[PDB]
């Protein structure tokens, strides 16, 4: 919760940088918009590095991506 602790508290959200400003003149470590530089390295979902999931609903459990590849990994087993 406590972003600007041992500082004066939250002044405002700077949306140009995506960061909070504390009541002394220091930038905070907390983000305040989604267009801030976050260091994302781990993403969930399947059919990444293809087009994503082709959204037809299938009688069987195969999951097919938008470029024809078939995800055997997200597919349910028998």
């Amino acid at each position: 919760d406590g972003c600007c602790s041992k500082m004066g508290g939250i002044n405002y959200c700077d949306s140009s940088a995506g960061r909070l400003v504390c009541n002394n003149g220091f930038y905070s470590t907390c983000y305040c918009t989604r267009h801030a530089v976050m260091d994302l390295q781990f993403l969930m979902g399947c059919c990444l590095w293809h087009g994503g999931v082709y959204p037809q609903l299938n009688s069987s459990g195969l999951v097919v991506c938008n470029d024809g590849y078939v995800s055997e990994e997200c597919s349910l087993q028998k």
Binding site: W49, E73, C74
Partner: protein
């Protein structure tokens, strides 16, 4: 059964079906963590950027086989010493490929769920782990195919058995009408694709010495 004197289930499949998915997802997460830990070494190893040709053209992929025999049926055989094949053809690119389209495994967290339940859930867990390892091994084979084919192309171009791609560019001047102009139009088109040559009289050999003392 055995000797002459010796002579004289639905939860089963439900246990396997919940164990396989959980094992697969957990092992996929661990594989992705190991891949993300070693991200700089894989970029140093699979350096596609320093294999690119002149006009940002990806090199063709070539395959090699040695000491070949085919028994076509009874009464006929065919043998050869080496064979070379063009698996993939050269083309223009805007960005080089990276290892992440080959090696990254896909994760979705499965949140969709007692005497002998435990052992079969555990067996399903082992089956899912083994399946994930097999999938990773096929991915490794695929990335090795692309890099090895391009590397083999560089060696055969050096040893004068393939032809390089030939490219032509045309310079238009200031083109357009009074509603739209483009200042310096240039059109680039590769007109000859790389190909193996069957004239064996121009082939060039490479002999590498060692000298000491």
């Amino acid at each position: 059964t055995g000797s002459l004197a010796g002579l004289q289930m639905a939860l089963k499949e439900t246990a396997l079906s919940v164990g396989a998915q959980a094992g697969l997802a957990w092992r996929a997460k661990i594989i992705d963590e190991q891949l993300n830990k070693q991200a700089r070494n894989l970029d140093a190893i699979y350096d596609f950027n320093s294999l690119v040709l002149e006009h940002n053209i990806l090199p063709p992929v070539l395959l090699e086989g040695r000491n070949t025999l085919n028994l076509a049926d009874a009464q006929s055989i065919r043998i050869s010493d080496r064979t070379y094949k063009v698996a993939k053809q050269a083309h223009f690119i805007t960005t080089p490929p990276t290892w992440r389209q080959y090696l990254w495994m896909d994760y979705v967290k499965p949140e969709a769920p007692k005497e002998i339940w435990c052992i079969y859930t555990e067996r399903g867990w082992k089956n899912g782990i083994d399946q994930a390892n097999t999938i990773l091994e096929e991915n490794i084979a695929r990335i090795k195919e692309d890099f090895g084919g391009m590397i083999l192309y560089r060696k055969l171009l050096a040893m004068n058995m393939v032809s390089p791609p030939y490219v032509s560019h045309t310079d238009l001047g200031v083109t357009g009408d009074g509603s739209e102009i483009h200042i310096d139009d240039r059109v680039l088109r590769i007109t000859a694709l790389p190909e193996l040559n069957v004239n064996s009289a121009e082939w060039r050999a490479a002999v590498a010495k060692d000298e000491n003392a």
